[PDB]
Ligand binder design. Structure first.
Ligand SMILES: Nc1ncnc2c1ncn2[C@@H]1O[C@H](CSCC[C@H](N)C(=O)O)[C@@H](O)[C@H]1O
Ligand SMILES: Nc1ncnc2c1ncn2[C@@H]1O[C@H](CSCC[C@H](N)C(=O)O)[C@@H](O)[C@H]1O
Ligand SMILES: [Mg+2]
Lengths: 211, 218
RNA sequence: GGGCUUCAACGCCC
RNA sequence: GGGCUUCAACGCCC
């Protein structure tokens, strides 16, 4: 399954961008996070677990395995990361952090052999990296609920779909407003970020006959 | 929205059993859960428990299930089932701890005391219970094992075939690898959910999604 | 140098 | 005793 990148601006893919991601290294370096740095401190700006949670939730999906998914992370401090669909993200937060810390310092994680870059810090904005036919949407409890399967079917045969989800514990849905066409809800109940991710993946897997 | 428990034998509902879960306390003079990060050194020394120490998988799965609409709607209960044969019932309203460190603490305490009690309420949130799982299950309940090597199904379709008074119980192996026979003795069949191997959590979302679709949950 | 791993890097082991 | 928290218990702070 040929790998999706920001260069390919034609192919019809689904893109999820994890926004307000908490990825702030703390000099001692390790990732700043509630557990260890509860005491040191506002806990909300320090929830990298949520990101780590979603990455597993996202890369483990049938849709990524079918390579019609693309993940981006955009932290709460405006750092932008392209995730390579084929990267086998560490399963444990600890190992995750080691890696995440390194990537922030070096700006990219390279495969020990291939020329590919498993993870890369790219320059803003995110609009310069998305496909040219691409619907921009924000997830929000405070919006009209939808069936993900229905929504996906209304897309042009060429139109990709890029959803902005907040990798945060709480807060305003404004984080992507300068980019979005539309904000929508996936549920009557408020969801965790990772759950919102499953919902979309799964609805779109369904829409796209995966698999 | 009435809370579902094993005591109720009639309601139609979806049950997930996280079979083969890796929960084990660790002495050091303090207690923690046996886990591949802290104890990969030790485990190897003693020449075993190679990936028999993946409590995080259970943790992941739990968040994934309880965070799900089908849970919020009260049509889902979960059970755990340990490598070492311990069975846990999980009260559907329990706001499980978000991080693994805080999860560990609580599972270590649950294992030593056999229950976790609400500070104000007298209902338990987690409770160790007696095997077999099949006593605690609804009377009319379809039982299946999720398996990569089993016939693939569309869950929405798989569910609409259930008698209007018949529940569905799914056993997921909460583990990194292994034969999917951790439940051969209870289940009616085994099914696959994808042509790709899944992770336990993903299998779990996939299945919840499916029920949520078919049972009309938003 | 060699290895472990639902965790190329990370995190450990010899 | 009081408090914090997508984490009653847990893990922290006073
Ligand atoms: N009902 C819902 N529908 C679609 N997305 C939702 C949702 N509930 C939460 N989310 C997404 O999941 C993330 C968790 S933050 C949710 C907490 C709170 N309701 C607010 O703030 C949010 O960034 C949001 O994008
Ligand atoms: N393709 C698939 N379809 C349905 N369930 C799957 C699946 N892949 C994995 N699972 C579930 O996820 C769990 C953990 S992964 C299983 C490890 C081992 N390779 C087996 O086989 C399994 O116990 C199984 O129930
Ligand atoms: Mg207290």
């Amino acid at each position: 399954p040929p790998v999706l990148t920001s260069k390919d601006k034609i192919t019809k893919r689904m893109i999820v961008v994890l926004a307000m991601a908490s990825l702030e290294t703390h000099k001692i370096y390790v990732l700043l996070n509630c557990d260890d740095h509860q005491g040191l401190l506002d806990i909300s700006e320090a929830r990298p677990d949520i990101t780590h949670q979603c990455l597993l939730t996202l890369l483990d999906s049938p849709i990524n395995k079918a390579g019609k998914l693309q993940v981006y992370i955009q932290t709460s401090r405006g750092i932008l990361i392209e995730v390579n669909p084929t990267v086998r993200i560490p399963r444990t937060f600890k190992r995750f952090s080691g890696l995440m810390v390194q990537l922030l310092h070096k700006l990219s994680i390279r495969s020990v052999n291939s020329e590919e870059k498993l993870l890369k810090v790219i320059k803003n904005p995110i609009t310069d990296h998305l496909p040219t036919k691409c619907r921009k949407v924000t997830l929000s409890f405070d919006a009209p609920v939808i069936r993900v399967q229905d929504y996906i079917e209304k897309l042009d045969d060429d139109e990709s779909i890029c959803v902005f989800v907040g990798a945060m514990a709480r807060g305003k849905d404004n984080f992507a407003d300068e980019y979005v066409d539309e904000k929508v809800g996936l549920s009557n109940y408020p969801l965790s970020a990772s759950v919102a991710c499953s919902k979309f993946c799964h609805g779109a897997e369904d829409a796209w006959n995966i698999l």
